[PDB]
Amino acid sequence: ARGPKKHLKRLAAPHHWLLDKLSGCYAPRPSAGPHKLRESLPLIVFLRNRLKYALNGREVKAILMQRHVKVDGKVRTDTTYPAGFMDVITLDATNENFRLVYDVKGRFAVHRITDEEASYKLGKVKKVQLGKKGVPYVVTHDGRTIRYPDPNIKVNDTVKIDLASGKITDFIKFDAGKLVYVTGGRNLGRIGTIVHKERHDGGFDLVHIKDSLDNTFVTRLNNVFVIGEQGKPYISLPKGKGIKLSIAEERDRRRAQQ
Amino acid sequence: PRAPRTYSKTYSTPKRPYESSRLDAELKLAGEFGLKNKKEIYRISFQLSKIRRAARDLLTRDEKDPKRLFEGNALIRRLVRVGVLSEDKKKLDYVLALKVEDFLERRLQTQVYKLGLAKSVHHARVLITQRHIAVGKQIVNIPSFMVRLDSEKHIDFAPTSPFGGARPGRVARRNAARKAEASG
RNA sequence: UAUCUGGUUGAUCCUGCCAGUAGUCAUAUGCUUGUCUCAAAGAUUAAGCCAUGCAUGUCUAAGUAUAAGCAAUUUAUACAGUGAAACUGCGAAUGGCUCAUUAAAUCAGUUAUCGUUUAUUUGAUAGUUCCUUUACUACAUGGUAUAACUGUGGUAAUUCUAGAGCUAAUACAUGCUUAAAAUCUCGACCCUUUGGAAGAGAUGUAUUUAUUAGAUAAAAAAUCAAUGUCUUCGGACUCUUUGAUGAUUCAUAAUAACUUUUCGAAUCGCAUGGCCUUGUGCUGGCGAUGGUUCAUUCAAAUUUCUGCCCUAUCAACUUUCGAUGGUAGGAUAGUGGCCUACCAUGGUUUCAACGGGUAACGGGGAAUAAGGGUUCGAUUCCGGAGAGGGAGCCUGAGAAACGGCUACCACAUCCAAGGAAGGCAGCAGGCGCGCAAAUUACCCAAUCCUAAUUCAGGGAGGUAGUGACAAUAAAUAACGAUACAGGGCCCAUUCGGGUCUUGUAAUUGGAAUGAGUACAAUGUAAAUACCUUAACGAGGAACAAUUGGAGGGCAAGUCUGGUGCCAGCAGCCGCGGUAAUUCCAGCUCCAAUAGCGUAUAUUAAAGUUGUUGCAGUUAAAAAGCUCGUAGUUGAACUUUGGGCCCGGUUGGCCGGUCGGAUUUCCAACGGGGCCUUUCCUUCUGGCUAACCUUGAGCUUGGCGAACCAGGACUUUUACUUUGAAAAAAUUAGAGUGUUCAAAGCAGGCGUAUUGCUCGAAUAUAUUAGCAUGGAAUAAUAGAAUAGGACG
RNA sequence: ACCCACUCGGCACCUUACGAGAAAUCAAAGUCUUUGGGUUCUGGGGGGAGUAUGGUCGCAAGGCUGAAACUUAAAGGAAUUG
RNA sequence: CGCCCGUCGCUAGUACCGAUUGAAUGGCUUAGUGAGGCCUCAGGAUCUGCUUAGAGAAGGGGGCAACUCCAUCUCAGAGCGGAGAAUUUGGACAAACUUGGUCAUUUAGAGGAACUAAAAGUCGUAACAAGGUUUCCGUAGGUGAACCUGCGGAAGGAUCAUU
RNA sequence: AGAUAAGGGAAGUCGGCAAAAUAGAUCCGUAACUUCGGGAUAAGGAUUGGCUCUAAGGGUCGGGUACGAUCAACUUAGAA
Ligand SMILES: [Mg+2]
Ligand SMILES: [Mg+2]
Ligand SMILES: [Mg+2]
Ligand SMILES: [Mg+2]
Ligand SMILES: [Mg+2]
Ligand SMILES: [Mg+2]
Ligand SMILES: [Mg+2]
Ligand SMILES: [Mg+2]
Ligand SMILES: [Mg+2]
Ligand SMILES: [Mg+2]
Ligand SMILES: [Mg+2]
Ligand SMILES: [Mg+2]
Ligand SMILES: [Mg+2]
Ligand SMILES: [Mg+2]
Ligand SMILES: [Mg+2]
Ligand SMILES: [Mg+2]
Ligand SMILES: [Mg+2]
Ligand SMILES: [Mg+2]
Ligand SMILES: [Mg+2]
Ligand SMILES: [Mg+2]
Ligand SMILES: [Mg+2]
Ligand SMILES: [Mg+2]
Ligand SMILES: [Mg+2]
Ligand SMILES: [Mg+2]
Ligand SMILES: [Mg+2]
Ligand SMILES: [Mg+2]
Ligand SMILES: [Mg+2]
Ligand SMILES: [Mg+2]
Ligand SMILES: [Mg+2]
Ligand SMILES: [Mg+2]
Ligand SMILES: [Mg+2]
Ligand SMILES: [Mg+2]
Ligand SMILES: [Mg+2]
Ligand SMILES: [Mg+2]
Ligand SMILES: [Mg+2]
Ligand SMILES: [Mg+2]
Ligand SMILES: [Mg+2]
Ligand SMILES: [Mg+2]
Ligand SMILES: [Mg+2]
Ligand SMILES: [Mg+2]
Ligand SMILES: [Mg+2]
Ligand SMILES: [Mg+2]
Ligand SMILES: [Mg+2]
Ligand SMILES: [Mg+2]
Ligand SMILES: [Mg+2]
Ligand SMILES: [Mg+2]
Ligand SMILES: [Mg+2]
Ligand SMILES: [Mg+2]
């Protein structure tokens, strides 16, 4: 009402943050940034609740204000900066590098990566257009604008970003036999090797997707992120690599390693 | 505007207040197990009703169902873990065939009585309440504890208690003071 | 945990209700109350009124400081440390409270903006601006105020202000400084026809209008209008640029201009470096702030479909002057009768319109439930609406804002009567109203939010106090020895001991313990509690458990005394009239127990609302009879059977592993393909695929979906399967020593010296909408004066 | 016109109870807890009361629609023995 | 010697009709008047820049003698403007008030007419047996009251019955 | 005989006698009751001038085997 909201109560936050329902009435509202606040992770909850490197927002602020943490090469000393999918986070102290990817339960994992892998990121192009004076440009999933792309780069493709400059090194197209990451919905976190896509001109192009264990499913085209061709991926996959074990085999593995 | 604390009721009163069969049956149970109300029996029958309802709505589904397999194995495991259900009986119908005395046989009160440190369930009750017990190496003063079939090897007296040493006791120290006065 | 019982009768079986019975995150109230955890709390009546005090302000290295402020720099003579005030910039449109209004309205799920605004982030993004643009000009940077401050005053008073004197900006209001090339216009002049020119001007972005491009399934030829790039002027002729969407007049670009003319940095902090033609010469980093446009993000505004309680003792409603629509224009950020002008007569309704009522904010949800269901939802989350009732509006990206103004109305405050100031449905608190709801406490330590921002602020929030609203756990005693009374067994020797016993005692003992104090420590922003713990702290007259009842229903008195149809009891039947199992007491006993009763409302009981699942001859109820529209329902019939294969699940000895697993197997179970008259859409293309393709036993060459793109068409549904989506919390439920448990989402494991590691699942979530398989069941259409199909 | 046999459609009747029902009784009042052929109307303890009021029809008498307050633990059905 | 109906009379309670063009409260609304701010037509207090501009006097530079040129105190006067308060025209939004109208909910009322109880009141005895005239329905009329009578109907009859 | 009167407004009088007020037209709105025909101009409100315009409402002639020309009305509505 009357303007934008600036608070976010607990029990209204997205559940994949794993914020406890006790310990405060409010949740850290992500500031405006490159991602939607639903599919984002504030640096406060990432540093405190996933890494345990801090206990308070005061300690997170004390870490941020001395320019220790940087994300996508930029320092970003904001407590509620929305870190989203495949954003890289570099901590020069501890020489740590994380890449924000979903685990198969649908939450963000602490996926430690090396420096040569932290030197880039992939972006799913959302629209290709002609800017002013006829300059073509793309818009990635994190709102990055990249001018003068390759003319073969159409929508729903993946571009590899230099992450020091904003240039494109190469790009992956979108058709059958491509390794994808599911980012959104019930199947959020699986990796499943497109077999074919159905059009349905008028809304919500569907795509059929089968994992390494031949368990197929289907997803809207909004939630799919192609990350290479079948076999080799262009990034380091987290543990499990998006299989979505059933609860039976999950407790069998928990009884195996114990 | 904080998240409300969840709470639940743990028992249920019976429909008919006064019937002699239920009355003297539960009074026999209370006398044999050393309880202070019918509320404990009501709580145990409530837990048994929930368990039986889960078994019923699992049995309505056929076998080879993942939900039936998963939660039936989980429930059977939890019952054989607490020791209310024997190891041979793991077929989800003996779970329905259980009764409240099987649950009352696993309380710490009757377990202390069976281990023989009490000589009576009321002695076990006052011992547990007076902290002269340790189910592992930790004092527990709740008689309705539901030992987990591995703790009977560790049910014994507390180290920081009489019958475990390290201090005689309050009225013992008093009597030592009075007999030192008579010594003077 | 799918349960019934008492009451109509002289007795019976029924119908039928009354009463009982259990529960309530449903309240109130009575009596009583020891402990631990957790915790609602002026909603209901009055969205009634409010004393007082707080709840929104804010700075860095980085906008402005001569505080006549504090310091000491001693590096400083412009400043440069800190820093009140004030200007400036942001914020105050969030949060919090309440549920008055509101019944297709809100709201839920589901769409859309190819119909719009968007501060803030985040990512990109202005060489074009000196205007006769050769003095018009500061571009090592241009102007004017003004606050704070000094000083003079006013009034009874207010977060009231006047006059005078300074002074600043990222305040206002002006204003320049950077290429080149290319293309267009005009065009001097040479003058030729093939005609060429010197020179001048314009050409960023933003606004407005007009116009153009923004394309394309295929192949060649005939000549002209003039040759068109270059010629061997035969004409070889190509190159020709065109992105996206299902779809656009889209994105974008280009011409003609239009604008009272936007923007295109006169801003700030650190580091002070390189080149020399050594001048305060030229270059030069890391940031901050700002800035036009696009995109993104936070949103907002409209918007598609379907869904809302009770009423017909509301059946017709809407349209004067907006009702439904059309055209055009205004207005809006935009669509649109949103408004105006003209024009038409439309639009809704028994499939419940319109009107009325709601002791109606909607939903997530809550209680009770064998199933189905019934009732509630002011209230911890989401979405609305409101700030005493209306209306209007400034500022700003965002308000019809109220801890912002203006007016009226109603209440109401202070006056030295002139005038001034008001909005607790924010936090406490106070009057009222009531059957009914707490402290005018402490703190920003957590959770978060705002600011110029690590630092300040925050009655948001947290902590404690009141608190028998509800929930969780759980004391009020245990064990002996003596004295009686048993039941077997040794003796079977009279009735003698009795071992081992299960209870009773004007029998008696030592132990154990917490409630409660309390040194301490822990706890916490600081405390109080909790968990620990010195010392103290049970023997009964103590450290003493209540509430209701004892005819039945319905557990437990034919015990005693009093009363005598009186007093009274009794949810219902009933008790009481001088022998009361029912009143008042005592004794005893019973039910639940720190809780129990009472009232009211609701659920089950209630198959006494009946879809599941009632009854209608006589207990209540077939309309007097027939017709008949809406509604509901509606005969049968159209590919069946037979085969042949392929491969999945359950089995089955083999167990060929030591109660785990495999294969050749008899069978069942569900799938797919092919054939039996059985098209079960095909055109352009490509992969040509499985390929007659066979090179000697792994080689050179078949038919497009099995991989696509576009296509032409394409009977429509209902139903059902699967899947996407359906916020979290709640519900069910997996795991897990909160010490158990309600809970919570934690935790667990090591050589604990350096660390390692599992989690925080899953399911349900109607209806509507979306995609998908099936194609029985129920509808629908087709070729019959053939203006039918194939071709 | 009768008689016999049969058949369709009627008004009914007699006997039994497989069945139903509280019973009286019922070839429908059966095929209804083993609860679903299609469909219309009506009832929710007894009074107050088919009353009051408001509509609408009728010349009128009246008809159709149609409450509430209040009150009550029984009214009532079928059979049994007196 | 059971049960049982109604009038009338007393007492208490509930609701209804009711003259009073009753009353009060609340909502909506016609018409009239109409604050406020907003948009517009003006308006111009005041403040302020520029172009000048002339007179009268001071100073300075120059034929050095009158005289000539440039500056300073004075005050008219003219324009070119810019900002701009009060006030004001018209418009739309429109609070609020007045007077009516209408709807809804309570609320007074002489009197009238019901119902319910209570109470062994008065008068009869209508129904239950063939209830002593068989009961009951519809309709009409009448009578102190239950009720009676007429027409038609019913068996819930006192008849399942005369080949 | 005709009129006008401040403030009040039937206190005057047997009695509002007399006088005053109202009045036409257009638009809106119109109750009880009813013999359903009425009541009804119910009650009760608004508007009305001049000037300059706009709109609508007609006749007669004209077409091989949609329209044009011409002439003339007072009726209503609206706007400055
Ligand atoms: Mg935030
Ligand atoms: Mg009876
Ligand atoms: Mg009796
Ligand atoms: Mg009841
Ligand atoms: Mg309310
Ligand atoms: Mg809010
Ligand atoms: Mg930016
Ligand atoms: Mg329009
Ligand atoms: Mg229109
Ligand atoms: Mg309400
Ligand atoms: Mg809310
Ligand atoms: Mg508001
Ligand atoms: Mg108020
Ligand atoms: Mg307001
Ligand atoms: Mg306030
Ligand atoms: Mg308050
Ligand atoms: Mg007692
Ligand atoms: Mg009593
Ligand atoms: Mg009894
Ligand atoms: Mg009694
Ligand atoms: Mg007694
Ligand atoms: Mg039931
Ligand atoms: Mg019934
Ligand atoms: Mg009947
Ligand atoms: Mg009939
Ligand atoms: Mg019909
Ligand atoms: Mg049909
Ligand atoms: Mg459908
Ligand atoms: Mg016959
Ligand atoms: Mg017949
Ligand atoms: Mg009923
Ligand atoms: Mg009834
Ligand atoms: Mg009878
Ligand atoms: Mg008599
Ligand atoms: Mg008599
Ligand atoms: Mg008679
Ligand atoms: Mg008689
Ligand atoms: Mg008679
Ligand atoms: Mg009779
Ligand atoms: Mg007579
Ligand atoms: Mg009868
Ligand atoms: Mg006069
Ligand atoms: Mg008079
Ligand atoms: Mg008089
Ligand atoms: Mg007189
Ligand atoms: Mg008189
Ligand atoms: Mg007269
Ligand atoms: Mg009249």
Which domain range does residue A126 map to? Answer: 121-171
Say how many domains are in chain A.
3
Last residue of a domain, one of A97, A116, A135: A116
Place of tokens 């073969």: A152
* Residue B70 near chain A (CB below 8 Å): yes
Distance from CA of A111 to the nearest CA of B (A): 31
Task: Note whether A41 and A136 are same-domain residues.
Answer: no
Angle between helices B20-33 and B39-59 (to 10 degrees): 110
What three-state secondary structure class fits A24?
A: coil
Collect all residues of chain B within an 8 Å Cβ-Cβ radius of residue A250: none
Q: Which experimental method was this entry solved with?
A: cryo-EM
Residue A233 exposed, middle or buried by CB count within 10 Å (0-12, 13-18, 19+):
middle
Task: Note whether A3 and A104 are same-domain residues.
Answer: yes
Residues B125 and B119: their CA atoms lie apart, in Å, by 11
Task: Note whether A111 and A1 are same-domain residues.
Answer: yes
Would A257 be classed as within a structural domain?
no
Task: Note whether A150 and A196 are same-domain residues.
Answer: no
Which residues 175-214 of chain A have a CB under 7 Å from nucleic chain C? 175-176, 184-187, 196, 198-204, 206
Task: Note whether A112 and A184 are same-domain residues.
Answer: no
Collect all residues of chain B within an 8 Å Cβ-Cβ radius of residue A25: 1-3
Are A22 and B3 an interchain contact pair (Cβ–Cβ within 8 Å)?
yes
Q: Identify which of B1, B2, B70 has the shortest CB distance to residue A247.
A: B70
Instruction: Indicate if CB(A3) is under 7 A from strand C.
Output: yes
Task: Note whether A4 and A111 are same-domain residues.
Answer: yes
Task: Note whether A139 and A208 are same-domain residues.
Answer: no
Would A250 be classed as within a structural domain?
no
Would A109 be classed as within a structural domain?
yes
CB atoms inside a 10 Å sphere around CB A124 = 24
Contact status, residue B117 vs residue B158, Cβ threshold 8 Å: no
Q: By a Cβ cutoff of 8 Å, what residues of chain A touch chain B?
A: 9-11, 21-22, 24-25, 246-248, 251
Would A106 be classed as within a structural domain?
yes
Would A251 be classed as within a structural domain?
no
| CA nearest to A126, candidates A136, A137, A140 | A140
Instruction: Indicate if CB(B14) is under 7 A from strand C.
Output: yes
Task: Note whether A9 and A48 are same-domain residues.
Answer: yes
Residues A186 and B108: their CA atoms lie apart, in Å, by 45
Q: How many residues does chain B have?
A: 184
- The torsion angle over the Cα atoms of residues B92, A248, A194 and A231, rounded to 10 degrees, is -160
Would A249 be classed as within a structural domain?
no
- Using the Cα atoms of residue A38, residue A41, residue A44 and residue A48 in order, give the sign of their dihedral: positive
Would A143 be classed as within a structural domain?
yes
CB atoms inside a 10 Å sphere around CB A219 = 23
Task: Note whether A42 and A99 are same-domain residues.
Answer: yes
Task: Note whether A98 and A129 are same-domain residues.
Answer: no
Which nucleotides of chain C have an atom under 7 angstroms from any protein CB?
1, 3, 21-25, 38-40, 92-97, 111-112, 119-125, 205-206, 243-246, 251-254, 293-299, 301, 380-385, 397-402, 445-450, 454-455, 460-462, 470-480, 510-514, 532-534, 536-538, 554-556, 591-594, 707-710, 723-737, 739-746, 758-763, 770-772
Q: What angle do CA B125, B130, B133 make, to 5 degrees?
A: 80
Task: Note whether A60 and A88 are same-domain residues.
Answer: yes
Task: Note whether A166 and A207 are same-domain residues.
Answer: no
Residues A122 and A163: their CA atoms lie apart, in Å, by 10
Residues A253 and A237: their CA atoms lie apart, in Å, by 20
Would A127 be classed as within a structural domain?
yes
